[PDB]
Design a protein around this nucleic acid. Structure first.
Ligand SMILES: [Mg+2]
Ligand SMILES: [Mg+2]
Ligand SMILES: [Mg+2]
Ligand SMILES: [Mg+2]
Ligand SMILES: [Mg+2]
Ligand SMILES: [Mg+2]
Ligand SMILES: [Mg+2]
Ligand SMILES: [Mg+2]
Ligand SMILES: [Mg+2]
Ligand SMILES: [Mg+2]
Ligand SMILES: [Mg+2]
Ligand SMILES: [Mg+2]
Lengths: 114, 52, 96, 95, 236
RNA sequence: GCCUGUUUACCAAAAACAUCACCUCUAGCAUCACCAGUAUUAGAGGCACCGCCUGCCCAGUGACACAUGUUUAACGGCCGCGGUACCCUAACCGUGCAAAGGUAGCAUAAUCACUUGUUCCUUAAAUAGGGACCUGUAUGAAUGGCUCCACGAGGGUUCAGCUG
RNA sequence: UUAAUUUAUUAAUGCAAACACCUGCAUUAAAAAUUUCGGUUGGGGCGACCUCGGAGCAGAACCCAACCUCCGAGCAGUACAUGCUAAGACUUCACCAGUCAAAGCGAACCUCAAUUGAUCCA
RNA sequence: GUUAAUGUAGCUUAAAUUAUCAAAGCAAGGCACUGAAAAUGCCUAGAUGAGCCUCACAGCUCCAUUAACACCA
C-alpha cells in the first residue's frame, strides 16, 4: 500500500519564521516551511529540524499522507495502518482478559491447598 | 603466547640470563656463554618471569 | 534405553518455561496453558509459578502419566550469551 | 627552589638533584641514562650498552643544576680512593 | 534556654494543675518532635494509676465510690472521680461506669478466683482466664503503664508457676507476676476509633501542627511487612 | 484543585503546599521532648473529603526475615515478532522474551511529535470553546483512576447588557 | 550519587580486658567529611580523536600543517657470543629517549617500517 | 537526517574457517499394532551483488529491519 505521489510543481512553498520555541535563533530564522498543495486545500507547516534540508524533505513526507486522504478517502494506506495497528489493541486487551481470568483460577486454587 | 623464562647457569653459578620461549614446548636447556668461567656452559631454566 | 535424548540445548535463562519446551521441542505457548491447567509439576509437587528456577536434577513434568526433563550440567563456556548450553533429559514414559 | 629559607635565610638544595647527578669540580654534571635497568629483555646488546653509560649534561642542564645546589656541592672533595678523581680536572681544553 | 518543666508538683490533689505546652521543644530549646503546637489550653488532672493503695493509717482492701465520670483533655479515656474513706482521687473509668457505683480495690489472691465486676481492681492471681483487663502493672507496686488508653482491653491468657500472662492490645503477650494488680473491663470512651476530625481546624485545636510540605520518596521500609508476632516479653 | 487555609517580605498567590479522609511503617514503655502520655496511644511517611473503585508483577534494588522466604497504598515495572481475519472482515494459528506483559476507567487531555487529528454544535467567518470518535506506539488506577456537590482575586469559552 | 578517598563520629555485633557499663581492637551499618568533574575542536555540546610507522600533499638536500587524503603497528620468527669493550659520527627540529659503528678482547669457520612507556616505588 | 545493530533449512539457537541436531515432513527399522529408543537421508544462495585471498568469517556494493542523537542562546 504505497502512498500516491505528488508532482514537483504546484507546491507553493513559503518560508516564514513561524512559531519560535527559542531565544534568538528561532525568532530570526525562516525555517518553517508552509508547503502547500495548489489543487486541494492542504496546508502543511514544519519546524521539525533546525534545517530546511530535513524540514522540507519531511514536510513533503507529511503532505503525502494528508492529500492521500483526499484522493482515496477512509480506504487509504494512511488509514489502513491506523486500523491495522489499532486492530492489535483489540488483540491486546482481549488477550489480557483471558489471562487475568486464568490468574484467579490459579490464585484461588492457590492457598485453598489444605 | 610466549613466556620470558630465566636461565640459571650450572658452572660459574649465579649467572642468569632471560630468554623467550613458547608457553607449550618444554623447559629450555641451552649452551650459552658464561662470562664467570669465560666458557660456554649448559644453562637450565628455572622460573618463568613473565608470560608476555 | 527407557528414553534418553536431547542433550546440549542452549537455553536462555534457567526457568520452567525454557527448561521446558527446549526439551519437548515446542514453544512457550502450550506450556503457559499447561501451566494454567494444574499441570507442569516439579519434583512430584505443583509449580504454581512458571518462573521457578531449575538446578541440576529437578525433574520436569506436564502430564500428557508424565514425561520428565531431568538436568545435569553447568557447562561452563559461553555460547554467545545464551550461555546455558546444558544437557537435559527427555521422556514420554509413565510414572506411578 | 627555596631562595631564602625560613630558619637561617640561606638557599636550599633540591635534594632530588643530589640523589641522581654527580658534579665534577670542573663544571660538568655526570648523570645516568633513563631506563638503564628497565625492560632489558626487549633491548638490543648495542642499546643495552648505551644505557649503562655515565653521561655528561648540557650547558643549560648544568646551569639548571647549579642554581639548584648550594656551594657545598660545588667543592673540592679530596677523597680516599675516588673512582672519579681523574675527572675533576679539565685537561687540554682550548675552550 | 530557661526551660523548667511544669511537672513540679510533688503531692497528689484532685485539682486541675495548670500545664505548659512544650511546642515539641527540648530543654535546650530546639525541636525534638515535629508537629506539636499551640492547641487549646488544658489543665492536668493527676491520675492515680496505683489503683490499689491504702491511705494513711489504713491497710487492706477497700471499696470506693464514683462521684463523677468526666472528660479528660490529656488522655483519650475519660476519668472518674472516686472517693473512699476520707480521700478523693482521679482514676480512669471503665466502659460502663456511672456515678454511684461502688468499686472494689482488693489485695487478695485467694484459693479460688473472683467473679469480679466491671470496674474493680484485683491482682491477676484473683481472676479467671479469658477475662478482659486494663491498667496492668509490670511490677507489683509499680503503677499502671499498659492498657490504659481508651477502649482498650487485654485478655488474661493463662497463669503459670507463680505468674500470670497477659495479651496486650497490640496482640503481644506479656508475662508478669501474679500479684500485680489490674482492673477488669475495658477502658472507657469506646468509639474513640469511630471519630471524625472533620476539618483541619479541629486538628489544630488538639495541638497538632501540619506536616511538612517536603515530598519524601518512600524507601525500603514501606512494604506490607508481614512479620511474626514478637515473642513474649517477660517481666519475671 | 474537593473545600476554609498557606507560600517565594521586594517581579510568581498558583493548578504548588497543607487539609479532613484513606493506608503503610516503627514502637510493650515512666520522672526534661514524645509525656506527667501507654497500641482506640505515640512517632515517621504517602496520597488527598465523599461516591465508585485501586488490575497484573517480588526478577532486580531496597526493607524485613535467614522456614533463600515475605513484602509493591515500598523503589519501580506492566513486551513483542511472524501473519489467515473481506457488507474491512472467526488466527481460525505458529512463536520469541520476561518477574509481569497495561485491567477497569478515561481520552488529541495542562499528557513527545505529527497537531490547525477527524467530525458535529457554536461564528458571516473559529489554530479558540464544547460534545463525540480514537493507540493514547510517550493514557492509566494512593506517581492514585474515574464521576460529582459546594467553593476559587486560579485558567480558558460564552449569552445578554453595559460602556471613549 | 552506583565519582574517588576515608570511618574520626555516634549506633550495632565480635574479641580482648575487667570481675552489664567504661576502655582498647576488629567488622557491618547509617550518617557524614574532603576533593575532582581531561584536552583537541572553523563557538561549545554530540560524534570522532589523542602514541608509533609507511605513502601523498611535500615532483629534485633536509624540514613542512590539516576534524587532510589512503594503508598499517601494540607482534611473530630464529638464535642462544641476541658475550664484552671502544675511535668516530647520526639524531625526528629542544631535553629525554632513539640510531650506526672501525679497531681491540673472547668466540666463530639477528630477520622485519612501527612491533611501544620515563621517574619514584613494589 | 545521522551514525549503530541485526539478518539461518519449513520451524528455534548454534557454530569465530571447515556448517550442525533439535523438532516437523519420507519411510522403513524394535514391537500384535500405536509411543519413544534407534538407524537414515532430508532441507540453510548462511537476507545481498561483485571477488582482495580462499571465506556466515572480512568489508563495501545492498535490500528491508529496529534502537538511539539531531542541543544551548
Ligand atoms: Mg499526615
Ligand atoms: Mg506531601
Ligand atoms: Mg484550593
Ligand atoms: Mg506560616
Ligand atoms: Mg513577591
Ligand atoms: Mg506573605
Ligand atoms: Mg496537593
Ligand atoms: Mg482562598
Ligand atoms: Mg574544551
Ligand atoms: Mg565544533
Ligand atoms: Mg637534534
Ligand atoms: Mg670489531
Amino acid at each position: 500500500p504505497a502512498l500516491l505521489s505528488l508532482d514537483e510543481n504546484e507546491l507553493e512553498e513559503q518560508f516564514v519564521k513561524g512559531h519560535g520555541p527559542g531565544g534568538q535563533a528561532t525568532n530570526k530564522t525562516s525555517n518553517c516551511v508552509v508547503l502547500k498543495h495548489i489543487p486541494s486545500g492542504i496546508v502543511v507547516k514544519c519546524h521539525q529540524t533546525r534545517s530546511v534540508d530535513q524540514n522540507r524533505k519531511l514536510a513533503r513526507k507529511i503532505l503525502q499522507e494528508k492529500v492521500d486522504v483526499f484522493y482515496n478517502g477512509e480506504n487509504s494506506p494512511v488509514h489502513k495502518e491506523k486500523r491495522e495497528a489499532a486492530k492489535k489493541k483489540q488483540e491486546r486487551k482481549k488477550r489480557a482478559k483471558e489471562t487475568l481470568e486464568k490468574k484467579k483460577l490459579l490464585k484461588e486454587l492457590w492457598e485453598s491447598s489444605k | 603466547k610466549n613466556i620470558l623464562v630465566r636461565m640459571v647457569s650450572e658452572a660459574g653459578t649465579g649467572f642468569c640470563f632471560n630468554t623467550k620461549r613458547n608457553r607449550l614446548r618444554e623447559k629450555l636447556t641451552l649452551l650459552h656463554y658464561d662470562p664467570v668461567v669465560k666458557q660456554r656452559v649448559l644453562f637450565v631454566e628455572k622460573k618463568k618471569i613473565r608470560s608476555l | 534405553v527407557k528414553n534418553y535424548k536431547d542433550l546440549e540445548k542452549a537455553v536462555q535463562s534457567f526457568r520452567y518455561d525454557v527448561v521446558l519446551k527446549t526439551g519437548l521441542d515446542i514453544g512457550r505457548n502450550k506450556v503457559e496453558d499447561a501451566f494454567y491447567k494444574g499441570e507442569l509439576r516439579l519434583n512430584e509437587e505443583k509449580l504454581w509459578k512458571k518462573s521457578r528456577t531449575v538446578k541440576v536434577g529437578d525433574t520436569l513434568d506436564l502430564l500428557i502419566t508424565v514425561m520428565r526433563i531431568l538436568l545435569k550440567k553447568v557447562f561452563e563456556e559461553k555460547t554467545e550469551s545464551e550461555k546455558y548450553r546444558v544437557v537435559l533429559r527427555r521422556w514420554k514414559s509413565l510414572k506411578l | 627552589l627555596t631562595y631564602f629559607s625560613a630558619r637561617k635565610g640561606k638557599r636550599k638544595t633540591v635534594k632530588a638533584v643530589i640523589d641522581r647527578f654527580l658534579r665534577l669540580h670542573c663544571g660538568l654534571w655526570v648523570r645516568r641514562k633513563a631506563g638503564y635497568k628497565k625492560k632489558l629483555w626487549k633491548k638490543t646488546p648495542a642499546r643495552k650498552k648505551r644505557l649503562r653509560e655515565f653521561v655528561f649534561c648540557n650547558k643549560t642542564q648544568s646551569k639548571l643544576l647549579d642554581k639548584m645546589t648550594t656551594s657545598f656541592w660545588k667543592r673540592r672533595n679530596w677523597y680516599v680512593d675516588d673512582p672519579y678523581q681523574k675527572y675533576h680536572d679539565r685537561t687540554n681544553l682550548k675552550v | 534556654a530557661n526551660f523548667v518543666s511544669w511537672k513540679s508538683r510533688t503531692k497528689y490533689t484532685i485539682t486541675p494543675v495548670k500545664m505548659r505546652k512544650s511546642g515539641g521543644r527540648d530543654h535546650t530549646g530546639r525541636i525534638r518532635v515535629h508537629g506539636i503546637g499551640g492547641g487549646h489550653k488544658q489543665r492536668y488532672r493527676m491520675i492515680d494509676f496505683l489503683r490499689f493503695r491504702p491511705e494513711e493509717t489504713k491497710s487492706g482492701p477497700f471499696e470506693e465510690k464514683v462521684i463523677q465520670v468526666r472528660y479528660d483533655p490529656c488522655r483519650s479515656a475519660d476519668i472518674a472521680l472516686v472517693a473512699g474513706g476520707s480521700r478523693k482521687r482521679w482514676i480512669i473509668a471503665t466502659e460502663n461506669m456511672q456515678a454511684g457505683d461502688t468499686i472494689l480495690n482488693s489485695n487478695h489472691i485467694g484459693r479460688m478466683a473472683v467473679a469480679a465486676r466491671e470496674g474493680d481492681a484485683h491482682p491477676l492471681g484473683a481472676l479467671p482466664v479469658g477475662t478482659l483487663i486494663n491498667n496492668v502493672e509490670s511490677e507489683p507496686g509499680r503503677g499502671a503503664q499498659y492498657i490504659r488508653a481508651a477502649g482498650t482491653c487485654g485478655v488474661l491468657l493463662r497463669k503459670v508457676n507463680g505468674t500470670a500472662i497477659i495479651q496486650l492490645p497490640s496482640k503481644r503477650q506479656m508475662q508478669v507476676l501474679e500479684t500485680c494488680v489490674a482492673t477488669v473491663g475495658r477502658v472507657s470512651n469506646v468509639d474513640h476509633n469511630k471519630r471524625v476530625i472533620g476539618k483541619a481546624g479541629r486538628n489544630r485545636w488538639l495541638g497538632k501542627r501540619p506536616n511538612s510540605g517536603r515530598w519524601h520518596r518512600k524507601g525500603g521500609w514501606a512494604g506490607r511487612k508481614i512479620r511474626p508476632l514478637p515473642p513474649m516479653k517477660s517481666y519475671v
